[PDB]
């Protein structure tokens, strides 16, 4: 079990002559600075590096190439003394031998958890993500499945992934208490008690203009998600202290709602638009209420 506070850090664009290395160092230093400014120095235990970024097909200008997960960690690891690694990893291009090689490399580099994921919709000889969960379990021994508590059929989908060896579930961004009802029914139906990495994403006013979070959580026809998107739209437009209050209230509703269910809990902090002092001001008040 991780019992950790994880901060998501997206690898920089690698299309420059430095391959993103200067940007990676500055990003790490911005993390330390923002944590220090908000009373969170030394509190973040892990960085969550995604090894997959879904691309919105309707965005006019394309994503640039991104730094490899392990290249990125190698650069930022010296700048974040004491912080360890978590990641997601695409397994579609990793046969069983190559999956053991990648796992050994990530373990040796200091990664403690790995969530196996699929390929973006707009992009094949390896293991399916759910088959990888139980392989070479001594390497990076925290093995993550993605958990979206609003998604149709998620009770049977996530139960199966626990059967196949998931030790933790990394949630989609949480903008309602749907995870409370989900885990209450999961605990009732099953004996599985994976660690839950509860994901919380700061919403700046830029979301009102860009709508990236709204798109990241979209599920057309799902009324529970519609409610979440309405919550995100509301937050985007509220004044800074108002959106902090509402996000902290949501945090408290989730933590209280799941605290007696028997799942180990970690916290996954996300700033989709980039780390900032306002994001960390919100994180700090959340973690002041409850921290793993």
Numbering used by the authors: 2 to 124, 129 to 297
How is this structure described in the published paper?
Methylene‐tetrahydropterin reductases catalyze the reduction of a methylene to a methyl group bound to a reduced pterin as C1 carrier in various one‐carbon (C1) metabolisms. F420‐dependent methylene‐tetrahydromethanopterin (methylene‐H4MPT) reductase (Mer) and the flavin‐independent methylene‐tetrahydrofolate (methylene‐H4F) reductase (Mfr) use a ternary complex mechanism for the direct transfer of a hydride from F420H2 and NAD(P)H to the respective methylene group, whereas FAD‐dependent methylene‐H4F reductase (MTHFR) uses FAD as prosthetic group and a ping–pong mechanism to catalyze the reduction of methylene‐H4F. Mutational analysis of four functional amino acids, which are similarly positioned in the three reductase structures, indicated despite the insignificant sequence identity, a common catalytic mechanism with a 5‐iminium cation of methylene‐tetrahydropterin as intermediate protonated by a shared glutamate. Based on mutational and kinetic analysis, evidence has been provided that all three methylene‐tetrahydropterin reductases have the same fold, similar methylene‐tetrahydropterin binding positions, and the same basic catalytic mechanism; however, the binding modes of the C1 carriers and reductants significantly deviate.
The flavin‐independent enzymes, named Mfr (Gehl et al., 2023), was currently identified only in mycobacteria as a monomeric enzyme. Recently, we reported the crystal structure of Mfr from Mycolicibacterium hassiacum (hMfr) and provided evidence that Glu9 in the active site is the key catalytic residue for 5‐iminium cation formation. Thus, the mechanism of eMTHFR and hMfr is basically identical. Position A contains a glutamate residue in all three reductases. In hMfr and jMer, apparent k cat of the equivalent Glu9Gln and Glu6Gln variants decreased from 594 to 1.3 min−1 (0.2%) (Gehl et al., 2023), and from 18,200 to 71 min−1 (0.4%), respectively. Neither variant showed a significant increase in the apparent K m for their respective C1 carrier, suggesting that glutamate and glutamine bind in a related manner. In addition, we obtained the crystal structures of the inactive variants jMer_E6Q, and hMfr_E9Q to exclude perturbations of the active sites. X‐ray structure analysis of the jMer_E6Q and hMfr_E9Q variants were performed and the structures were compared with the wild‐type enzyme, which confirmed unchanged active site architectures compared with the wild‐type enzymes.
